[PDB]
Short mmCIF file of C-alpha atoms and ligand atoms in Angstrom, two decimals:
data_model
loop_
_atom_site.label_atom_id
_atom_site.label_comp_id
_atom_site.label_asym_id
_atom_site.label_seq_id
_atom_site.Cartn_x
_atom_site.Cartn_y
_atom_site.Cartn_z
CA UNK A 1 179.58 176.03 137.90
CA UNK A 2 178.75 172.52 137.16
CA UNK A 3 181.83 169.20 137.71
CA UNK A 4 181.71 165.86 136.87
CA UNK A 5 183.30 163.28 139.31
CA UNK A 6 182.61 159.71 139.49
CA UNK A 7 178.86 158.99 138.50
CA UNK A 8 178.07 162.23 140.03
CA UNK A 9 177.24 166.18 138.62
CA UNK A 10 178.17 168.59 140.90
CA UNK A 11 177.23 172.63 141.10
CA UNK A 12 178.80 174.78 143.00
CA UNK A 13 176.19 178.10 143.93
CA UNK A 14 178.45 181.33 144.90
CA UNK A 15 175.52 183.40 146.89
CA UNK A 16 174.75 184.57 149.73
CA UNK A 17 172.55 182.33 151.46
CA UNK A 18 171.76 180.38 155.05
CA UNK A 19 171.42 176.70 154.65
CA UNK A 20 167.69 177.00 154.49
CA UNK A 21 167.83 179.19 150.87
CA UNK A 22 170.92 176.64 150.25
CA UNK A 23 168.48 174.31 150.36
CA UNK A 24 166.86 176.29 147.78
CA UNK A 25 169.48 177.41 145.73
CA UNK A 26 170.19 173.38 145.21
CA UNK A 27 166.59 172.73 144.08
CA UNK A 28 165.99 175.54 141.48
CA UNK A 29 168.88 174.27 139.91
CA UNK A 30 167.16 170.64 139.85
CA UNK A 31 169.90 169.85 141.65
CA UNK A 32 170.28 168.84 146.19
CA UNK A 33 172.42 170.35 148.86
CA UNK A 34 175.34 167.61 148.97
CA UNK A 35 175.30 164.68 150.53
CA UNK A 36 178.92 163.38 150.88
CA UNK A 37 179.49 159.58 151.24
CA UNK A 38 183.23 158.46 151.15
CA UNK A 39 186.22 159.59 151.13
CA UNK A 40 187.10 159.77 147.30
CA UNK A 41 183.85 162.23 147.01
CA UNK A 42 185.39 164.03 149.57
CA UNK A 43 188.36 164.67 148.52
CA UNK A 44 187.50 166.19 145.11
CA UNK A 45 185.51 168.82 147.21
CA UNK A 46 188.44 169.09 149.11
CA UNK A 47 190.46 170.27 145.81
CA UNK A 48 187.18 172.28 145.02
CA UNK A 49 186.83 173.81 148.25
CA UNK A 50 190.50 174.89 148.71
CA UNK A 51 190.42 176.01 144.93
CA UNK A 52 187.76 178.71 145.74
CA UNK A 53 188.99 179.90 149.46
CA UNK A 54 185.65 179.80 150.88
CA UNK A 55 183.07 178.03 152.95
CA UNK A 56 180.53 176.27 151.84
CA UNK A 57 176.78 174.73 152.44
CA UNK A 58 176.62 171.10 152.96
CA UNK A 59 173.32 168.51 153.34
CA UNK A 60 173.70 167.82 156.74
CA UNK A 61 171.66 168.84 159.82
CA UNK A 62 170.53 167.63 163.02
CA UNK A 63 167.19 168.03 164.62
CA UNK A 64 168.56 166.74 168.23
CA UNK A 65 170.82 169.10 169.28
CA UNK A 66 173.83 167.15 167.35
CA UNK A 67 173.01 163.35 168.70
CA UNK A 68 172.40 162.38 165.19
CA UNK A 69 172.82 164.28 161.85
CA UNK A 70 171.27 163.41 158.58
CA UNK A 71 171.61 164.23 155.05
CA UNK A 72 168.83 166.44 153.75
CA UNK A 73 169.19 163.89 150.33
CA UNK A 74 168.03 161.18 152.41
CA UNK A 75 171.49 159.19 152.07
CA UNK A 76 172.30 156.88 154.71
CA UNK A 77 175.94 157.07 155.43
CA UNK A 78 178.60 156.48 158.31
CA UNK A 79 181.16 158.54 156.43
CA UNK A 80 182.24 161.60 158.66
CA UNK A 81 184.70 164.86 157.88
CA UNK A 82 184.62 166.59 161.06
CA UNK A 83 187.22 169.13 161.36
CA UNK A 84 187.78 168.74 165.06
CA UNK A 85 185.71 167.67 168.51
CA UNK A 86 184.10 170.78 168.54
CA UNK A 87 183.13 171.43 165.44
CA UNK A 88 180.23 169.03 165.42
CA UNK A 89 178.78 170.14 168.66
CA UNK A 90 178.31 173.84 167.76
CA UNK A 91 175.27 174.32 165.75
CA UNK A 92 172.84 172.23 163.60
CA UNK A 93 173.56 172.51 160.25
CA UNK A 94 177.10 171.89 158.54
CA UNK A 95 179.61 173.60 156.04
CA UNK A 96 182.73 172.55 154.66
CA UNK A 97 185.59 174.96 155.29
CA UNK A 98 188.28 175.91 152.54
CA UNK A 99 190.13 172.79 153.60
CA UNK A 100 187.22 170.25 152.84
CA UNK A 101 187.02 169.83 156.77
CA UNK A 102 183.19 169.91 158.28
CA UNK A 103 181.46 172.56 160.90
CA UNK A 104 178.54 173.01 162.81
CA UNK A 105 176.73 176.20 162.89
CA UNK A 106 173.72 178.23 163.20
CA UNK A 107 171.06 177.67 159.99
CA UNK A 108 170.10 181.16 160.29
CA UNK A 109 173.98 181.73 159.17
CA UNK A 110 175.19 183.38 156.15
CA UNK A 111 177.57 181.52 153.80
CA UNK A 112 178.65 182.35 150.15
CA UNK A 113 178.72 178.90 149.05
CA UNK A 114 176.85 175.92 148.32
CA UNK A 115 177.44 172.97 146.83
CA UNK A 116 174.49 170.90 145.22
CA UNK A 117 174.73 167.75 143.73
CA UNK A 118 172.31 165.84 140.64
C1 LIG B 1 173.55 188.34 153.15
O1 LIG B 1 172.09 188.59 153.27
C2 LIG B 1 171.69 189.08 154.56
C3 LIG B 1 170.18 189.13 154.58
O2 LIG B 1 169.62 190.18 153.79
C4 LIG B 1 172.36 190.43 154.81
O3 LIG B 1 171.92 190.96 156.05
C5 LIG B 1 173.87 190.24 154.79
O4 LIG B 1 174.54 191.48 155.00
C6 LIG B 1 174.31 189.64 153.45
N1 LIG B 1 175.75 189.42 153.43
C7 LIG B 1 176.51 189.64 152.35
C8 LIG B 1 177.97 189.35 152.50
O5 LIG B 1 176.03 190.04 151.28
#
């Protein structure tokens, strides 16, 4: 499923994938696991997101057990959506929940959702 919003194309993969074949997913639809810069962006995943009921597959990982996290697009970015204290401290690579909000999880996880971004 494929949204416009700002200067950006969206797609939004329903499969069941870890991040790693998220990561993928994005790619064989010429397309990269999002990377999510501001809070406009955010909020029409937000509408997405709670739209669908589901979690989904975001760009962002950390190779440092959590001191820094990085989008897997390369964009640099202070912008943050963490759900709660916790939720960036358990696991290294992130989701957005069916409220928008962001969590930290194993990789090796399975998730029904992506979203990918041109
Ligand atoms: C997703 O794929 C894994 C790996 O084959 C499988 O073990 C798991 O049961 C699948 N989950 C769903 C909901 O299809």
């Amino acid at each position: 499923n494929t949204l416009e919003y700002g200067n950006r194309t969206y797609k939004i993969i329903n499969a069941n994938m870890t991040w790693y074949a998220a990561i993928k997913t994005c790619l064989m639809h010429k397309a990269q696991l999002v990377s999510i810069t501001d809070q406009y962006h955010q909020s029409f995943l937000t509408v997405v997101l709670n739209r669908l009921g589901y979690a989904h597959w975001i760009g962002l990982f950390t190779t440092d057990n959590g001191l820094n996290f990085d989008w897997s697009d390369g964009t640099k970015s202070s912008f943050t959506f963490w759900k709660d204290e916790e939720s960036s401290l358990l696991g290294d690579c992130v989701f957005a929940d069916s409220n928008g909000r962001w969590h930290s999880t194993a990789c090796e996880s399975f998730l029904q959702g992506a979203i990918c971004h041109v």
